[PDB]
Amino acid sequence: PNDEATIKALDNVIKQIEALSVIVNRSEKADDAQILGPNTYKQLLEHLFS
Amino acid sequence: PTRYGTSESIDKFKIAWENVESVLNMEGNDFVKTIMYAYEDNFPKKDFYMM
């Protein structure tokens, strides 16, 4: 058996497993809420007499 | 022995086959590599790995 090939295989395996183990998942999604800007009532016309 | 022996999904086979493919391109193993790639259909990779 050639003893160089197995060293390369071991190195590749170690690199792959440790690269796959450094990835961390962390999301920063915001909320689905609203803002609710200011507002005022609008009056409707009417008629008056006495 | 344990931990995914003969009862594994097919999707796990690629990871195992990667090492064999890497070894089979080591500048001096061309005979077996060529014989494999020429007659893959009659002798599939799964039985070669088992042997």
Side-chain angles (χ1 to χ4, degrees), chain A residues 2 4-5, chain B residues 21-31 33:
Chain A
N2 186 14
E4 310 139 357
Chain B
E21 277 204 57
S22 70
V23 162
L24 271 177
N25 303 328
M26 212 65 228
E27 278 307 86
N29 308 340
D30 46 343
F31 203 97
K33 182 241 187 66

Side-chain angles (χ1 to χ4, degrees), chain A residues 22-30:
Chain A
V22 86
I23 169 59
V24 65
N25 286 337
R26 171 249 195 199
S27 290
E28 207 198 3
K29 175 212 51 163

